[PDB]
Amino acid sequence: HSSGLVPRGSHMANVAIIGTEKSGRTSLAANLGKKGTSSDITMYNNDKEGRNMVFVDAHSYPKTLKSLITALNISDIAVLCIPPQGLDAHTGECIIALDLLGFKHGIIALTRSDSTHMHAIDELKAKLKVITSGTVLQDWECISLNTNKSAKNPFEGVDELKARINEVAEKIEAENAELNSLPARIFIDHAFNVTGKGCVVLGVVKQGISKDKDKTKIFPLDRDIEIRSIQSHDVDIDSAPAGTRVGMRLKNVQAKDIERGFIISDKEIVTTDYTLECTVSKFTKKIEPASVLHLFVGLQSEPVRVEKILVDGNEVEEAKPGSTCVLELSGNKKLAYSKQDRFLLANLDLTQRFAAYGFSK
Ligand SMILES: Nc1nc2c(ncn2[C@@H]2O[C@H](COP(=O)(O)OP(=O)(O)NP(=O)(O)O)[C@@H](O)[C@H]2O)c(=O)[nH]1
Ligand SMILES: [Mg+2]
C-alpha cells in the first residue's frame, strides 16, 4: 500500500556529469534535463522520460573539489566528459578521484564529436583503454557524442548515452533495493526556508526506506526531528527507498542551522578527530606528521592536521605515495559519519589534489 493514485515505482537514476574545463559538461547536462537547484553544483531534472532522473553538473570543478565530491557522493552513475585531445591534468584528477572512491558505475562521454573525426576518436578510445586499465573505469563504455543541433551529425551518440544510462540505472535499482532493509540514512545537500512551509531539505536516501512522519534525528546537531512530509519530483510520497532523491519538510529544526553534509538518521558518529585506515594515491606527495590536508566524508569537507602516522601498529615519520597506513587526524568542526562512509583526503595546493581514501578505525 502506498500514497497517491500510482506508486512511484522505483525507476530512478542519480547521475553526475563531470570532467575537465571545456569538456561540454554543462551543455550535456543542460540538454538532458530541466535546470533546477543551483548552488556550486546544478541539478538538471528529467522525470519526463520514465525514470526520475537527476543529472548533477559539478560546475564549480576544477576550481573546487567539493563541487566534484558532492556531485559524486549524491550520485550512483558518473559520466566523465572528455573532449578531443582532452587527456589533461583535470581529466587525470577526475579519473584518480573516481578510482579512489571505488566508483562502480559509469560511462565516458567523448564529447564534441562534431569537432573531430572517427579515426581520431578511435585513437582517443585506444588511449583511454590504457589510462583506465587496472582502475574502476576499466570496463566503462566510451560513447562519442555531441549536443550540437547544427552539426553534420546533430546529437549523435546522445541516444546511445541515454540508453546506456538506463541500462546501468536498472542494475543500480536492484543494488539499492538490497539496502532497503537497513536503517534509514538521508544525506542533505541543500536546506532552505519556504514561505508558509518552513524548513525544507533536499537530499538523497543512502540506505533503508525513509517514511513520512518518521521521528528520527539530525546529525551532527544530535537533535530530535520529525519528517513532516517527503516529496519526490514535487509530489508528496509516503516513503522513499534507498536511492530516492527527496525534498523533506522537517519539524524541530531551522534551515539556518542545517548545512550540506548533515545527516538524517537515528544514530551517527560525531567527532572532530579521526583515526583512518588509509591507502595513499601513487600520484601525490608523501604525507608527514603536522601536514595539513582536506578531508571529505559524505557531503562534508574540512581542513585537518596529520597528528600521527602508523604502519602495522608502529609509528613512522611519513606515508609514501602508494602505501597503506593509519592516519590520526585532527580538525576543528564536528562531522557526522558512520563506519561505512568512505573518507577522501586531499591537498588543495597540489596539481593533482587527491591524496588518499580511508575508513574510520
Ligand atoms: N561543436 C560543439 N561545441 C560544443 C559542444 N558542447 C559544448 N560545446 C562548446 O564548447 C564550450 C564548452 O562547453 P561547456 O558545456 O561549457 O563545457 P564545460 O566543461 O561545462 N565548460 P566549463 O569548464 O567552462 O564549465 C562551449 O563554448 C560550448 O558551446 C558540442 O557538442 N559540439
Ligand atoms: Mg561545467
Author numbering: -10 to 350
Please give the exact wording used by the authors of the publication that reports this structure.
The putative translation elongation factor Mbar_A0971 from the methanogenic archaeon Methanosarcina barkeri was proposed to be the pyrrolysine-specific paralogue of EF-Tu (“EF-Pyl”).
We determined the crystal structures of M. mazei MM1309 in the GMPPNP-bound, GDP-bound, and apo forms at 1.7, 1.9, and 1.55-Å resolutions, respectively (“Materials and methods”). The electron density is well defined for the phosphate moiety and the guanine base, but is weaker for the ribose than the other moieties of GMPPNP. In the crystal of the MM1309·GMPPNP complex, the phosphate moiety is recognized by residues Lys11–Ser16 (corresponding to the EF-Tu residues His22–Thr26), which correspond to part of the P-loop. The guanine ring is mainly recognized by the conserved Asp103, located in the 310 helix between β6 and α4. The side-chain carboxyl group of Asp103 hydrogen bonds with the N1- and N2-atoms of the guanine moiety. The Mg2+ ion is mainly coordinated by the β- and γ-phosphate moieties (3.0 Å) and a water molecule (2.3 Å). In addition, the side chain atoms of Thr15 (2.9 Å), Arg14 (3.4 Å), and Asp46 (3.3 Å) participate in the Mg2+ coordination. Surprisingly, MM1309 bound GMPPNP·Mg2+ much less strongly than GTP·Mg2+, with a dissociation constant (K d) of 222.2 μM. Therefore, the present GMPPNP-bound structure, which is very simlar to the GDP-bound structure, may be different from the true GTP-bound structure.
